[PDB]
Amino acid sequence: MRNKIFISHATPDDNDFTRWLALKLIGLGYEVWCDILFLDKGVDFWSNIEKVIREDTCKFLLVSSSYSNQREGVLKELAVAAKVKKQLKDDKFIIPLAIDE
Amino acid sequence: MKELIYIEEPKILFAHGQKCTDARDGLALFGPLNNLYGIKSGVIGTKQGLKIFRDYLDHIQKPIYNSNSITRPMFPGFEAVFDCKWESTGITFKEVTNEDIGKFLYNSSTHKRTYDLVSLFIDKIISANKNEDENVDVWFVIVPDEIYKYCRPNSVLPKEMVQTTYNYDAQFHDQFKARLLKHTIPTQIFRESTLAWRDFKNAFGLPIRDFSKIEGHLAWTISTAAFYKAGGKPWKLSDVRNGVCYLGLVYKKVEKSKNPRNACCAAQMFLDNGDGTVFKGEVGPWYNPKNGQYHLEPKEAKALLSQSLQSYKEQIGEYPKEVFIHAKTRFNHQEWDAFLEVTPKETNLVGVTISKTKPLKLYKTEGDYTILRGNAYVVNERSAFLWTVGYVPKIQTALSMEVPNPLFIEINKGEADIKQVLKDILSLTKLNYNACIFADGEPVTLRFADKIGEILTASTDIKTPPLAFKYYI
Amino acid sequence: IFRDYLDHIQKPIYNSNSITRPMFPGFEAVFDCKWESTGITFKEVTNEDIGKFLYNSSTHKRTYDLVSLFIDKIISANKNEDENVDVWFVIVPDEIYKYCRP
Amino acid sequence: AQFHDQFKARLLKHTIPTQIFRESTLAWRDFKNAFGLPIRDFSKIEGHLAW
Amino acid sequence: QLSYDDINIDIVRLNAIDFKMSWARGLKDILEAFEKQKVPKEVADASKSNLLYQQIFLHDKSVIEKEEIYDSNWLSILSFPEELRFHEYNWMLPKRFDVRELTFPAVRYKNYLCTFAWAYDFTYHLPKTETYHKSKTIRIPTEEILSGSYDSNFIRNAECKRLIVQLLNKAFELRMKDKEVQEYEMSNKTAYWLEKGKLEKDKFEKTMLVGKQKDKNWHFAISGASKLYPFPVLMISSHIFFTADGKKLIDSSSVQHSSRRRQGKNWWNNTWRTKLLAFIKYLSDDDTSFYLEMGSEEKVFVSNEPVKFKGNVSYNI
RNA sequence: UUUUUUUUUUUUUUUUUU
DNA sequence: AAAAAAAAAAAAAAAA
What we know:
Chain E: NAD(+) 3 binds at residues 4, 14, 16. Chain E: Keywords: Nucleotide-binding, Receptor. Chain E: NAD(+) 2 binds at residues 4, 15. This is part of a larger assembly, with 2 copies of chain A and 3 copies of chain B. Chain A is an alpha/beta fold. Chain A is built from 3 helices and 4 strands, in the order E-H-E-H-E-H-E. Chain A is globular and about 30 Å long. By secondary structure, chain B is of the alpha/beta class. The two termini of chain B are 43 Å apart. Chains in contact: A-E, B-C, B-D, B-E, C-D. Chain B binds a DNA/RNA duplex through helix 7, strand 7, helix 8 and strand 18.
């Protein structure tokens, strides 16, 4: 079953907000996946993210920022989120988050 | 202004499940369907005729250029296009002395001379088959040019060279390929002019058979013929639906017996269990008395249909669902009644009549260019006119030379969807294995059947003939 | 079984005592010949077909029937098939070998 | 009454090379006796069979 | 089996060249990108490589959708007689007499003379017919024959429409004779060619119909054929015949056939169609149609413009 | 007969009429 | 002994 909530973000800068939101959500018992926190070392990180999004990611959360708009990693994870959105047939799968004023 | 609709191009299958419209280009790039490891060739003829064969084989081993590559793509090499070897080494050669070929040729009677020339070849080929260890997949026999002058019907030998059987026709080719049916020996006929033309010259100094520009096309049409006679599938159809056998009847005369007796022959094409398309003739020749009947008697018609349908159960198992019989001559009700009785309840029998006689010629309003191929003016639910021969821009010109004459399609019997029929005849024009061309002017069923009929009408002693096209084209 | 043996003899095989009888280094290496299991002409003979003729009282007519049941198929394949055969490898069962000989 | 001689006798008018193969001469590993060993065991001899 | 949904992420971003249905269009896209992105390419052989590059795009020549009107060889028939008359000449017509010599076309059926003309058109050839009675006529409303409604013991639809193509054929023959041309008899048919000097400079409209080739004078010729199965039309087929001095046809079959081969080698669609329509326009009686002489007052108006067709596909050179 | 196509010689039948 | 509308078979030349 799909019971994971991936958090798309830029890992160098938006790491603080991502970590805070992930800790708050796990405080609420919502399973959360973050590359800063739940990514394993010594593994194919892109493939692991791909499996998490395709199989286990129930909801996709995007932290939209002045950096997260044009980075290749956030773009690729967003596109895979769009593919999973198409396959699951859930119009509310992707919920972007705007943090930068 | 009358509407005419265009059937989509019949589009043929190739290796790896790959699909290409053009057969020559499809073989040139994607290769053939099946793998022939190597071709074992045997040559029967004189020493002077063997040298030209070796030279022409060496020529066709390398890629050979055509003058206008866009009109006709060149031949890039047999080993490249059919992914098979066929070289000059390892050929079982048979001598034919010039004395032997001159002693028999210079005869007063054309029937005796053609019978003896055919015998001099077939006897030695039979001896090679029965007496030697070497295996020959296909036999290439070289024949000189004087024989073509003085070994055919109505060819009068000049008085100055007259030095010195009647139950057989005077043609060398038909007798040669007919008397070899019992031994299952595939053989292909070469003219020594069809070989390296450059040696033979006319009075003007230019050789009579100018092949300088179009050498690539001849290379293509000999390579595909050799591969077909070697045991391979050049290309296959992919638009054919299951449970449909077609069959093609063409009526040929027989002169050996009194009255033409109108030998009848058929060629089968259908879908087999799986995807493989099985194209074999149905040769049980049903002799038809009367000078100009051209209609099967009930007994022969019922037999022909019985072995036609059993040819489908024997390797598929169930009865065909919808048969589409094609023919050059109209069907009368007597043969249809014979047909329907043998025909089972589920099978839907269709008789379709095709004719080149109708003088319809569509002329374009402006320009030195003709109608496309595939255009079809439909008259009604039962009759139509389809231009199977015409311009296809892939060839950039016509398969004919003058303004082409379309086929007159008429569903004489059965009900049939007329457009379903017209989506198949254009498809039936693609499977010409004896020549590597875009398509033929008429469906290959009525062409291969015509050829096998023209061959089975030559020999008296055929019994249980072979139903493969290898022995005929 | 024929396909399995063809695959086996495609690969080289070793005998117990190489001094008594040498190893077979592979068909392709020995004979410089290509002979694979792909593209083999196959004409199937039903077990019911080899059972109907087999269970006969007289050896002569049963042997004639078994011989015909294969020769007719072979000649039909030669005369009516596009695919060419250099050699016709005729696999025969062992019950026939038991009960189709003098 | 023997399959071999008649079989390659009647195919003579067609000139077709043939090889009669027993299922035992092939992968005999299936063909077993009561004691459990193959009757025609060529485990040491399989190289000669291939040759 | 590989949907675009399950592609790898780093590949999900990248636009993919499709190979699924065709392996040739994919390579087409690859090469298109390669000259688009300026991938280095060693020209090398420059001949085989060029051939393969041309071969891959088979694609330069595909089905393109534009309406294209076509001109056939079928001359549409515009009008027909009111009645099909079967006059009972009987003894007025001698038995051992030829129906071909009659001024207007006339086919004998049983004891009824079948023609589209009225009773006393034929007094000159048959003086015994002056005392005929018009109440013996078996006139039939020809339009019903074309529809197919009329069928009876007197005549069958197959045998009542087969007499219309015969009579119309002799009508065409007599009309073409009225145009005063010489004839080349065929094995079965009949084709008519126009003289040398009969036309002004042997050229009608802007198209020459009789010209020279070495010492062999070629003459454009046509033949007539009426068949009413799909439409009521007049089939016309172009032909080329030869004369040694401009008038006397060569009796040698091989020489004439070889010559026709020589000219037809270089005569394309616009060389056959234009000549055929020009000769038809010469045969025209007015600006739109021509009539064939079959009787004193009844005439069949055959259009001089060939039946046009319409095709949804065209092409370019 | 490497092919193909367009022709011209012939020739023949069927249905009907006297 | 015709008619027209349908048939095949062979011969000759030039292209593909």
